[PDB]
PDB file of C-alpha atoms in Angstrom:
ATOM      1  CA  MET A  14      10.068 -14.873  10.044  1.00 40.70           C
ATOM      2  CA  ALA A  15       7.472 -13.421   7.350  1.00 38.63           C
ATOM      3  CA  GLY A  16       4.083 -15.085   6.208  1.00 36.31           C
ATOM      4  CA  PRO A  17       3.856 -16.530   2.684  1.00 33.93           C
ATOM      5  CA  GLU A  18       0.826 -14.218   2.014  1.00 32.11           C
ATOM      6  CA  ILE A  19       2.397 -10.955   3.008  1.00 29.95           C
ATOM      7  CA  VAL A  20       5.437 -11.704   0.892  1.00 28.84           C
ATOM      8  CA  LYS A  21       3.211 -12.332  -2.129  1.00 28.36           C
ATOM      9  CA  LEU A  22       0.882  -9.395  -1.280  1.00 29.13           C
ATOM     10  CA  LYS A  23       3.994  -7.114  -0.907  1.00 28.63           C
ATOM     11  CA  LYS A  24       5.429  -8.333  -4.303  1.00 26.59           C
ATOM     12  CA  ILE A  25       1.865  -7.630  -5.967  1.00 26.22           C
ATOM     13  CA  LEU A  26       1.461  -4.132  -4.421  1.00 27.68           C
ATOM     14  CA  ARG A  27       4.906  -3.293  -5.600  1.00 23.98           C
ATOM     15  CA  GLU A  28       4.003  -4.737  -9.127  1.00 26.20           C
ATOM     16  CA  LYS A  29       0.709  -2.725  -9.644  1.00 26.11           C
ATOM     17  CA  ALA A  30       2.114   0.654  -8.035  1.00 28.70           C
ATOM     18  CA  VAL A  31       2.738   3.922  -9.825  1.00 30.30           C
ATOM     19  CA  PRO A  32       6.410   5.069  -9.903  1.00 28.95           C
ATOM     20  CA  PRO A  33       7.054   8.051  -7.750  1.00 30.64           C
ATOM     21  CA  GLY A  34       7.517  11.205  -9.424  1.00 30.35           C
ATOM     22  CA  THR A  35       4.192  10.373 -10.665  1.00 25.35           C
ATOM     23  CA  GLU A  36       1.487  12.859 -10.037  1.00 29.42           C
ATOM     24  CA  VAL A  37      -1.699  10.849 -10.469  1.00 30.69           C
ATOM     25  CA  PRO A  38      -4.595  13.367 -10.651  1.00 33.36           C
ATOM     26  CA  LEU A  39      -7.166  13.233  -7.802  1.00 31.22           C
ATOM     27  CA  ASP A  40     -10.098  11.561  -9.561  1.00 30.44           C
ATOM     28  CA  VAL A  41      -7.796   9.029 -11.347  1.00 29.89           C
ATOM     29  CA  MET A  42      -6.830   8.166  -7.761  1.00 31.97           C
ATOM     30  CA  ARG A  43     -10.472   8.100  -6.550  1.00 31.52           C
ATOM     31  CA  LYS A  44     -11.662   5.941  -9.502  1.00 32.65           C
ATOM     32  CA  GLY A  45      -8.889   3.486  -8.760  1.00 33.41           C
ATOM     33  CA  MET A  46      -9.653   2.883  -5.105  1.00 34.47           C
ATOM     34  CA  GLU A  47     -13.251   2.505  -6.079  1.00 36.19           C
ATOM     35  CA  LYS A  48     -12.627  -0.017  -8.840  1.00 36.74           C
ATOM     36  CA  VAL A  49     -10.263  -2.189  -6.924  1.00 39.36           C
ATOM     37  CA  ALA A  50     -12.283  -2.046  -3.656  1.00 40.58           C
ATOM     38  CA  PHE A  51     -13.226  -5.542  -2.380  1.00 40.79           C
ATOM     39  CA  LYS A  52     -16.821  -6.531  -2.437  1.00 37.16           C
ATOM     40  CA  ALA A  53     -18.332  -7.169   1.173  1.00 36.55           C
ATOM     41  CA  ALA A  54     -19.087 -10.922   2.250  1.00 33.17           C
ATOM     42  CA  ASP A  55     -22.617 -11.555   1.162  1.00 34.40           C
ATOM     43  CA  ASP A  56     -23.793 -12.334   4.634  1.00 35.73           C
ATOM     44  CA  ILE A  57     -23.203  -8.612   5.416  1.00 38.44           C
ATOM     45  CA  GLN A  58     -26.383  -6.666   5.066  1.00 36.14           C
ATOM     46  CA  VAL A  59     -26.370  -2.916   4.648  1.00 39.97           C
ATOM     47  CA  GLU A  60     -29.031  -0.189   4.940  1.00 41.11           C
ATOM     48  CA  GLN A  61     -28.467   3.210   3.547  1.00 40.84           C
ATOM     49  CA  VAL A  62     -29.124   6.137   5.950  1.00 42.47           C
ATOM     50  CA  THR A  63     -28.491   9.803   5.993  1.00 39.48           C
ATOM     51  CA  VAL A  64     -26.600  11.220   9.071  1.00 40.34           C
ATOM     52  CA  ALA A  65     -25.517  14.950   9.473  1.00 40.63           C
ATOM     53  CA  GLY A  66     -26.329  15.597   5.867  1.00 39.09           C
ATOM     54  CA  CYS A  67     -23.946  12.818   4.761  1.00 39.69           C
ATOM     55  CA  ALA A  68     -24.604   9.467   3.003  1.00 42.74           C
ATOM     56  CA  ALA A  69     -23.929   6.536   5.536  1.00 42.77           C
ATOM     57  CA  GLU A  70     -24.758   2.736   5.621  1.00 41.48           C
ATOM     58  CA  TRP A  71     -25.420   0.637   8.768  1.00 43.63           C
ATOM     59  CA  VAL A  72     -23.162  -2.437   8.096  1.00 43.43           C
ATOM     60  CA  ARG A  73     -24.391  -5.506   9.898  1.00 44.10           C
ATOM     61  CA  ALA A  74     -22.688  -8.785   9.789  1.00 41.88           C
ATOM     62  CA  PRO A  75     -24.505 -11.856  11.260  1.00 47.53           C
ATOM     63  CA  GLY A  76     -24.672 -11.907  15.093  1.00 48.55           C
ATOM     64  CA  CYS A  77     -25.107  -8.352  15.962  1.00 43.53           C
ATOM     65  CA  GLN A  78     -26.272  -7.104  19.309  1.00 42.87           C
ATOM     66  CA  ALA A  79     -28.825  -4.271  18.979  1.00 41.00           C
ATOM     67  CA  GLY A  80     -27.862  -1.392  21.283  1.00 40.73           C
ATOM     68  CA  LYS A  81     -24.210  -1.668  20.266  1.00 45.48           C
ATOM     69  CA  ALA A  82     -22.796   0.515  17.319  1.00 48.79           C
ATOM     70  CA  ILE A  83     -19.455   1.427  15.607  1.00 50.53           C
ATOM     71  CA  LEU A  84     -18.962   4.759  14.253  1.00 48.08           C
ATOM     72  CA  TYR A  85     -16.624   4.059  11.374  1.00 48.04           C
ATOM     73  CA  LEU A  86     -14.167   6.629   9.700  1.00 48.07           C
ATOM     74  CA  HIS A  87     -12.701   5.374   6.420  1.00 51.87           C
ATOM     75  CA  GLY A  88      -9.127   6.043   5.110  1.00 50.58           C
ATOM     76  CA  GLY A  89      -8.094   7.662   1.902  1.00 49.25           C
ATOM     77  CA  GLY A  90      -6.093  10.569   3.052  1.00 47.53           C
ATOM     78  CA  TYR A  91      -9.072  12.871   3.657  1.00 49.35           C
ATOM     79  CA  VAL A  92      -9.252  13.350  -0.213  1.00 49.95           C
ATOM     80  CA  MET A  93     -10.663   9.917  -1.331  1.00 51.16           C
ATOM     81  CA  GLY A  94     -12.396   6.717  -0.008  1.00 51.81           C
ATOM     82  CA  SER A  95     -16.121   6.076   0.424  1.00 49.10           C
ATOM     83  CA  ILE A  96     -18.673   3.755   1.841  1.00 46.65           C
ATOM     84  CA  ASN A  97     -17.946   1.394  -1.143  1.00 47.09           C
ATOM     85  CA  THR A  98     -14.208   1.129  -0.573  1.00 46.49           C
ATOM     86  CA  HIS A  99     -14.601   0.333   3.051  1.00 47.19           C
ATOM     87  CA  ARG A 100     -17.732  -1.958   3.430  1.00 50.09           C
ATOM     88  CA  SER A 101     -15.751  -5.115   3.142  1.00 45.81           C
ATOM     89  CA  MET A 102     -13.299  -4.512   5.916  1.00 44.85           C
ATOM     90  CA  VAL A 103     -15.943  -2.878   8.142  1.00 45.48           C
ATOM     91  CA  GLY A 104     -18.476  -5.627   7.759  1.00 43.68           C
ATOM     92  CA  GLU A 105     -15.789  -8.050   9.007  1.00 46.53           C
ATOM     93  CA  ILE A 106     -15.116  -5.547  11.904  1.00 46.95           C
ATOM     94  CA  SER A 107     -18.918  -5.611  12.419  1.00 43.59           C
ATOM     95  CA  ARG A 108     -18.686  -9.445  12.493  1.00 45.94           C
ATOM     96  CA  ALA A 109     -15.805  -9.698  14.868  1.00 45.97           C
ATOM     97  CA  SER A 110     -17.342  -7.170  17.341  1.00 47.75           C
ATOM     98  CA  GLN A 111     -20.956  -8.295  16.913  1.00 47.23           C
ATOM     99  CA  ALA A 112     -21.896  -4.683  16.484  1.00 47.78           C
ATOM    100  CA  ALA A 113     -23.531  -2.826  13.625  1.00 51.45           C
ATOM    101  CA  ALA A 114     -21.314  -0.148  12.054  1.00 51.85           C
ATOM    102  CA  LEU A 115     -22.328   3.233  11.037  1.00 52.36           C
ATOM    103  CA  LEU A 116     -20.036   3.808   8.036  1.00 53.24           C
ATOM    104  CA  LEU A 117     -20.009   7.529   7.194  1.00 51.97           C
ATOM    105  CA  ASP A 118     -19.342   9.108   3.845  1.00 52.29           C
ATOM    106  CA  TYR A 119     -18.013  12.226   5.361  1.00 53.35           C
ATOM    107  CA  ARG A 120     -17.038  15.468   3.392  1.00 55.30           C
ATOM    108  CA  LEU A 121     -13.794  15.028   1.548  1.00 54.11           C
ATOM    109  CA  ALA A 122     -10.997  17.528   0.618  1.00 52.15           C
ATOM    110  CA  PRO A 123     -10.136  19.390  -1.381  1.00 53.60           C
ATOM    111  CA  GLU A 124     -13.763  20.305  -2.360  1.00 53.08           C
ATOM    112  CA  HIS A 125     -14.407  20.445   1.402  1.00 53.21           C
ATOM    113  CA  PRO A 126     -11.172  21.195   3.397  1.00 53.38           C
ATOM    114  CA  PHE A 127     -10.413  20.636   7.063  1.00 55.83           C
ATOM    115  CA  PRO A 128     -12.371  20.793   9.566  1.00 56.00           C
ATOM    116  CA  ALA A 129     -15.234  19.529   7.390  1.00 57.82           C
ATOM    117  CA  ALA A 130     -14.541  15.852   8.033  1.00 57.40           C
ATOM    118  CA  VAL A 131     -14.148  16.502  11.826  1.00 57.45           C
ATOM    119  CA  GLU A 132     -17.580  18.122  11.861  1.00 54.70           C
ATOM    120  CA  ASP A 133     -19.185  15.264  10.032  1.00 55.26           C
ATOM    121  CA  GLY A 134     -17.665  12.922  12.553  1.00 52.57           C
ATOM    122  CA  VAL A 135     -18.703  14.853  15.704  1.00 55.96           C
ATOM    123  CA  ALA A 136     -22.104  15.419  14.204  1.00 55.16           C
ATOM    124  CA  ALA A 137     -22.360  11.729  13.258  1.00 56.42           C
ATOM    125  CA  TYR A 138     -21.442  10.758  16.830  1.00 57.28           C
ATOM    126  CA  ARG A 139     -24.003  13.181  18.225  1.00 56.01           C
ATOM    127  CA  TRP A 140     -26.551  11.560  15.902  1.00 52.40           C
ATOM    128  CA  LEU A 141     -25.834   8.066  17.135  1.00 54.47           C
ATOM    129  CA  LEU A 142     -26.296   9.317  20.770  1.00 56.73           C
ATOM    130  CA  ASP A 143     -29.597  10.902  19.750  1.00 55.35           C
ATOM    131  CA  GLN A 144     -30.811   7.678  18.288  1.00 54.74           C
ATOM    132  CA  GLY A 145     -30.614   6.561  21.928  1.00 55.52           C
ATOM    133  CA  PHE A 146     -27.315   4.618  21.752  1.00 58.53           C
ATOM    134  CA  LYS A 147     -25.735   4.970  25.214  1.00 59.47           C
ATOM    135  CA  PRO A 148     -22.027   6.133  25.125  1.00 59.49           C
ATOM    136  CA  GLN A 149     -21.146   2.819  26.868  1.00 60.10           C
ATOM    137  CA  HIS A 150     -22.458   0.940  23.977  1.00 60.27           C
ATOM    138  CA  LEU A 151     -20.580   2.966  21.364  1.00 64.15           C
ATOM    139  CA  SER A 152     -17.152   2.575  19.751  1.00 59.53           C
ATOM    140  CA  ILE A 153     -15.211   4.756  17.128  1.00 58.57           C
ATOM    141  CA  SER A 154     -12.915   3.008  14.596  1.00 60.58           C
ATOM    142  CA  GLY A 155     -11.029   4.029  11.340  1.00 60.98           C
ATOM    143  CA  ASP A 156      -8.037   3.576   9.226  1.00 62.56           C
ATOM    144  CA  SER A 157      -5.246   5.796   7.720  1.00 62.16           C
ATOM    145  CA  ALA A 158      -6.650   9.322   7.684  1.00 59.85           C
ATOM    146  CA  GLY A 159      -9.727   7.839   9.408  1.00 61.11           C
ATOM    147  CA  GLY A 160      -7.678   6.660  12.403  1.00 61.11           C
ATOM    148  CA  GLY A 161      -6.498  10.111  13.066  1.00 63.14           C
ATOM    149  CA  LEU A 162      -9.964  11.430  12.424  1.00 63.96           C
ATOM    150  CA  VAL A 163     -11.056   9.094  15.306  1.00 60.36           C
ATOM    151  CA  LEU A 164      -8.989  11.012  17.686  1.00 60.92           C
ATOM    152  CA  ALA A 165      -9.854  14.371  16.195  1.00 63.74           C
ATOM    153  CA  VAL A 166     -13.580  13.501  16.749  1.00 64.70           C
ATOM    154  CA  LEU A 167     -12.968  12.322  20.322  1.00 63.36           C
ATOM    155  CA  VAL A 168     -10.935  15.502  21.152  1.00 64.85           C
ATOM    156  CA  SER A 169     -13.497  17.823  19.287  1.00 66.11           C
ATOM    157  CA  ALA A 170     -16.530  16.034  20.947  1.00 60.95           C
ATOM    158  CA  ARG A 171     -14.989  16.210  24.375  1.00 60.05           C
ATOM    159  CA  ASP A 172     -14.304  20.053  24.041  1.00 61.98           C
ATOM    160  CA  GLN A 173     -17.951  20.182  23.151  1.00 60.75           C
ATOM    161  CA  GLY A 174     -19.352  18.294  26.190  1.00 60.68           C
ATOM    162  CA  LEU A 175     -20.217  15.031  24.430  1.00 60.47           C
ATOM    163  CA  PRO A 176     -19.814  11.900  26.569  1.00 62.04           C
ATOM    164  CA  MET A 177     -16.826   9.693  25.493  1.00 62.62           C
ATOM    165  CA  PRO A 178     -17.828   6.308  23.950  1.00 63.19           C
ATOM    166  CA  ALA A 179     -16.616   2.932  25.496  1.00 64.20           C
ATOM    167  CA  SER A 180     -13.505   2.576  23.116  1.00 62.59           C
ATOM    168  CA  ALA A 181     -11.469   3.950  20.159  1.00 66.15           C
ATOM    169  CA  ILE A 182      -9.659   1.634  17.697  1.00 68.78           C
ATOM    170  CA  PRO A 183      -7.528   3.660  15.205  1.00 70.90           C
ATOM    171  CA  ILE A 184      -6.041   1.441  12.473  1.00 71.51           C
ATOM    172  CA  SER A 185      -2.680   2.739  11.052  1.00 71.31           C
ATOM    173  CA  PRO A 186      -3.732   6.255  12.237  1.00 73.88           C
ATOM    174  CA  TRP A 187      -2.522   9.332  10.284  1.00 71.94           C
ATOM    175  CA  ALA A 188      -2.394  11.584  13.184  1.00 72.46           C
ATOM    176  CA  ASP A 189       0.339  14.121  12.244  1.00 73.98           C
ATOM    177  CA  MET A 190      -0.061  16.216   9.076  1.00 71.79           C
ATOM    178  CA  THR A 191       3.365  17.707   9.154  1.00 72.14           C
ATOM    179  CA  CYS A 192       4.835  14.419   8.194  1.00 71.26           C
ATOM    180  CA  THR A 193       8.108  14.733   9.774  1.00 72.22           C
ATOM    181  CA  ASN A 194       8.725  11.572  11.806  1.00 70.37           C
ATOM    182  CA  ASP A 195      11.857   9.337  11.634  1.00 72.56           C
ATOM    183  CA  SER A 196       9.678   6.661   9.939  1.00 73.02           C
ATOM    184  CA  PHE A 197       9.279   8.635   6.721  1.00 73.15           C
ATOM    185  CA  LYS A 198      12.823   7.640   5.978  1.00 70.59           C
ATOM    186  CA  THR A 199      13.500   4.670   8.333  1.00 70.71           C
ATOM    187  CA  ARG A 200      10.360   2.524   7.270  1.00 71.82           C
ATOM    188  CA  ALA A 201      10.190   3.926   3.714  1.00 72.00           C
ATOM    189  CA  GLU A 202      11.916   1.153   1.706  1.00 69.86           C
ATOM    190  CA  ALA A 203       9.649  -1.633   3.482  1.00 69.12           C
ATOM    191  CA  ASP A 204       6.209   0.231   2.864  1.00 70.42           C
ATOM    192  CA  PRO A 205       4.634  -0.826  -0.515  1.00 73.35           C
ATOM    193  CA  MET A 206       1.725   1.600   0.198  1.00 71.19           C
ATOM    194  CA  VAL A 207       2.494   5.002   1.692  1.00 68.54           C
ATOM    195  CA  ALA A 208       5.182   6.743  -0.352  1.00 69.13           C
ATOM    196  CA  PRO A 209       5.309   9.787  -0.517  1.00 68.91           C
ATOM    197  CA  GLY A 210       4.748  13.250  -0.792  1.00 70.44           C
ATOM    198  CA  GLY A 211       1.678  11.654  -2.163  1.00 74.70           C
ATOM    199  CA  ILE A 212       0.872  11.941   1.607  1.00 73.30           C
ATOM    200  CA  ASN A 213       2.403  15.434   1.454  1.00 69.56           C
ATOM    201  CA  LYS A 214      -0.027  16.617  -1.184  1.00 66.79           C
ATOM    202  CA  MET A 215      -2.930  15.087   0.635  1.00 66.40           C
ATOM    203  CA  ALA A 216      -2.060  17.203   3.750  1.00 65.40           C
ATOM    204  CA  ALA A 217      -1.872  20.194   1.394  1.00 65.67           C
ATOM    205  CA  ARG A 218      -5.288  19.359   0.009  1.00 69.87           C
ATOM    206  CA  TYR A 219      -6.898  18.769   3.411  1.00 68.69           C
ATOM    207  CA  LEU A 220      -5.254  21.638   5.436  1.00 65.42           C
ATOM    208  CA  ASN A 221      -5.753  24.198   2.638  1.00 68.81           C
ATOM    209  CA  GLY A 222      -3.514  26.725   4.574  1.00 70.55           C
ATOM    210  CA  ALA A 223      -4.482  25.535   8.073  1.00 69.33           C
ATOM    211  CA  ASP A 224      -2.050  24.848  10.910  1.00 68.90           C
ATOM    212  CA  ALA A 225      -0.856  21.289  10.253  1.00 70.85           C
ATOM    213  CA  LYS A 226      -0.483  21.126  14.110  1.00 69.71           C
ATOM    214  CA  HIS A 227      -4.104  21.999  14.691  1.00 70.27           C
ATOM    215  CA  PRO A 228      -5.285  19.444  17.339  1.00 64.60           C
ATOM    216  CA  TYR A 229      -8.220  18.402  15.173  1.00 61.21           C
ATOM    217  CA  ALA A 230      -5.958  18.081  12.006  1.00 61.26           C
ATOM    218  CA  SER A 231      -3.143  16.436  13.767  1.00 65.76           C
ATOM    219  CA  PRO A 232      -4.351  14.839  17.158  1.00 65.43           C
ATOM    220  CA  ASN A 233      -0.852  13.670  18.030  1.00 63.51           C
ATOM    221  CA  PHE A 234      -0.574  17.322  19.269  1.00 61.78           C
ATOM    222  CA  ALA A 235      -4.079  17.573  20.855  1.00 60.92           C
ATOM    223  CA  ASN A 236      -4.799  17.300  24.486  1.00 62.66           C
ATOM    224  CA  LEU A 237      -6.140  13.792  24.980  1.00 61.39           C
ATOM    225  CA  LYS A 238      -7.077  13.881  28.737  1.00 62.03           C
ATOM    226  CA  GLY A 239     -10.244  11.934  29.098  1.00 60.34           C
ATOM    227  CA  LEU A 240     -10.527   9.991  25.803  1.00 58.51           C
ATOM    228  CA  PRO A 241     -11.635   6.417  26.466  1.00 56.30           C
ATOM    229  CA  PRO A 242      -9.520   3.100  26.148  1.00 53.05           C
ATOM    230  CA  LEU A 243      -7.514   3.053  22.828  1.00 53.63           C
ATOM    231  CA  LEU A 244      -6.469   0.019  20.793  1.00 54.20           C
ATOM    232  CA  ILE A 245      -4.064   1.114  18.156  1.00 54.20           C
ATOM    233  CA  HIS A 246      -2.959  -1.265  15.299  1.00 52.78           C
ATOM    234  CA  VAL A 247       0.041  -0.159  13.127  1.00 53.69           C
ATOM    235  CA  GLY A 248       2.331  -2.245  10.974  1.00 57.39           C
ATOM    236  CA  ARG A 249       6.048  -2.554  11.557  1.00 60.25           C
ATOM    237  CA  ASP A 250       6.785  -1.854   7.817  1.00 61.13           C
ATOM    238  CA  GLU A 251       4.967   1.376   7.435  1.00 62.85           C
ATOM    239  CA  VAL A 252       5.829   5.007   7.036  1.00 61.83           C
ATOM    240  CA  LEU A 253       3.289   5.888   9.661  1.00 62.17           C
ATOM    241  CA  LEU A 254       4.852   3.700  12.407  1.00 62.51           C
ATOM    242  CA  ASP A 255       5.903   6.761  14.289  1.00 61.41           C
ATOM    243  CA  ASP A 256       2.346   8.264  14.296  1.00 60.42           C
ATOM    244  CA  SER A 257       1.214   5.381  16.415  1.00 58.53           C
ATOM    245  CA  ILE A 258       4.272   5.281  18.846  1.00 57.13           C
ATOM    246  CA  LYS A 259       4.006   9.122  19.350  1.00 55.75           C
ATOM    247  CA  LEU A 260       0.221   8.898  19.852  1.00 56.34           C
ATOM    248  CA  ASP A 261       0.454   5.860  22.298  1.00 55.51           C
ATOM    249  CA  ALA A 262       3.027   7.774  24.480  1.00 54.45           C
ATOM    250  CA  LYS A 263       0.798  11.002  24.258  1.00 54.37           C
ATOM    251  CA  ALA A 264      -2.356   9.026  25.268  1.00 56.68           C
ATOM    252  CA  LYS A 265      -0.391   7.551  28.296  1.00 56.81           C
ATOM    253  CA  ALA A 266       1.049  11.027  29.154  1.00 53.87           C
ATOM    254  CA  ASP A 267      -2.564  12.296  29.057  1.00 58.14           C
ATOM    255  CA  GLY A 268      -4.142   9.758  31.297  1.00 61.36           C
ATOM    256  CA  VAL A 269      -5.448   7.577  28.540  1.00 63.33           C
ATOM    257  CA  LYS A 270      -5.621   3.695  28.742  1.00 64.35           C
ATOM    258  CA  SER A 271      -3.739   2.893  25.571  1.00 64.69           C
ATOM    259  CA  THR A 272      -2.579  -0.406  24.050  1.00 63.74           C
ATOM    260  CA  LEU A 273      -0.281  -0.081  21.019  1.00 63.20           C
ATOM    261  CA  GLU A 274       0.186  -3.372  19.072  1.00 61.42           C
ATOM    262  CA  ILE A 275       2.968  -3.135  16.354  1.00 61.59           C
ATOM    263  CA  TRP A 276       2.389  -6.079  14.132  1.00 61.92           C
ATOM    264  CA  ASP A 277       5.614  -7.350  12.644  1.00 60.04           C
ATOM    265  CA  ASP A 278       5.948  -7.597   8.884  1.00 59.98           C
ATOM    266  CA  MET A 279       2.724  -5.692   8.169  1.00 59.87           C
ATOM    267  CA  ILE A 280       1.764  -2.890   5.905  1.00 60.15           C
ATOM    268  CA  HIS A 281      -0.751   0.022   6.007  1.00 61.87           C
ATOM    269  CA  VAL A 282      -4.353  -1.066   7.076  1.00 60.80           C
ATOM    270  CA  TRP A 283      -3.253  -4.657   6.404  1.00 63.81           C
ATOM    271  CA  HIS A 284      -6.722  -5.402   7.719  1.00 65.13           C
ATOM    272  CA  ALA A 285      -8.205  -4.439   4.387  1.00 68.14           C
ATOM    273  CA  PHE A 286      -6.642  -7.423   2.828  1.00 66.49           C
ATOM    274  CA  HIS A 287      -8.197 -10.073   5.045  1.00 66.53           C
ATOM    275  CA  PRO A 288      -9.569 -12.016   2.136  1.00 69.18           C
ATOM    276  CA  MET A 289      -5.946 -12.967   1.353  1.00 69.17           C
ATOM    277  CA  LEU A 290      -3.989 -12.227   4.500  1.00 69.16           C
ATOM    278  CA  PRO A 291      -4.229 -14.422   7.706  1.00 66.42           C
ATOM    279  CA  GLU A 292      -2.969 -11.338   9.677  1.00 68.24           C
ATOM    280  CA  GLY A 293      -5.755  -9.002   8.288  1.00 69.14           C
ATOM    281  CA  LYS A 294      -8.254 -11.654   9.397  1.00 67.88           C
ATOM    282  CA  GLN A 295      -6.463 -11.977  12.844  1.00 73.04           C
ATOM    283  CA  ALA A 296      -6.234  -8.200  13.384  1.00 74.74           C
ATOM    284  CA  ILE A 297      -9.878  -7.708  12.564  1.00 76.23           C
ATOM    285  CA  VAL A 298     -10.719 -10.522  15.043  1.00 78.31           C
ATOM    286  CA  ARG A 299      -8.758  -8.594  17.610  1.00 78.85           C
ATOM    287  CA  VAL A 300     -10.319  -5.137  16.939  1.00 78.63           C
ATOM    288  CA  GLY A 301     -13.721  -6.728  17.739  1.00 77.31           C
ATOM    289  CA  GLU A 302     -12.524  -8.673  20.851  1.00 78.56           C
ATOM    290  CA  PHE A 303     -11.262  -5.447  22.262  1.00 79.33           C
ATOM    291  CA  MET A 304     -14.449  -3.412  21.356  1.00 77.39           C
ATOM    292  CA  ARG A 305     -16.008  -6.399  23.244  1.00 77.88           C
ATOM    293  CA  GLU A 306     -13.659  -6.324  26.273  1.00 76.45           C
ATOM    294  CA  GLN A 307     -14.276  -2.539  26.493  1.00 75.12           C
ATOM    295  CA  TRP A 308     -18.070  -3.342  26.389  1.00 72.70           C
ATOM    296  CA  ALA A 309     -17.954  -5.890  29.258  1.00 73.93           C
ATOM    297  CA  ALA A 310     -15.860  -3.561  31.673  1.00 71.87           C
TER     298      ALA A 310
END
């Protein structure tokens, strides 16, 4: 059944990984993601902007429609990640969708704990709408921590009277901080990426004493009535599989139009590895078709 690339990518991930008791300090972790981050295609142009007091970059592939925009929330556990780490994958999401991405460098824990990143998001989305972007022309997308953050923004912004955008594509969402799901054991051998209580210590760092079940911290527990069509990518072989099944069933319970795709043999944000993974390339293609189907409706 399994691609030759994912087998090789799996084997490499496993080769270069730290061995878990290992407490890698925060900024050793941060410096690593930065240094190994893939370089965007050079047909991606970028334009640095400041949004809600945060650094951002409009990320435009070739072929964008003006009027359409992605608000993008990067992964990294709420503790790490940046515009630089994520520009590759996003520019290809910008390509696939033919929409420019706003790629926020929202406030990271522990220097800025929860709900700091939710505020940046909400405020970023308000900012988009104030640049004259109609909700119908907007989309929110993100990976790992950033895929839960997507939902935590949509919930927050709804409670605040903000119109919903046309779509929401969480990628491998981390939508439950209390990290409890069957998958933390069942999928744990097969995940070369999420370990942990590497993830446990991230929650620690982001919550900083807050209720792990706080709807904006963990949107798997939020009321989701009214959020717009969801496309949710997860991989089979990930510790976060349950996050995505629980959230799909919660969306549906709440009245949401929700499509969960579980992609067999795949890892965490397998997207991010499109330069070397036919599936990352395929799944990015599909994020954008769906931001595009939601835009035609």
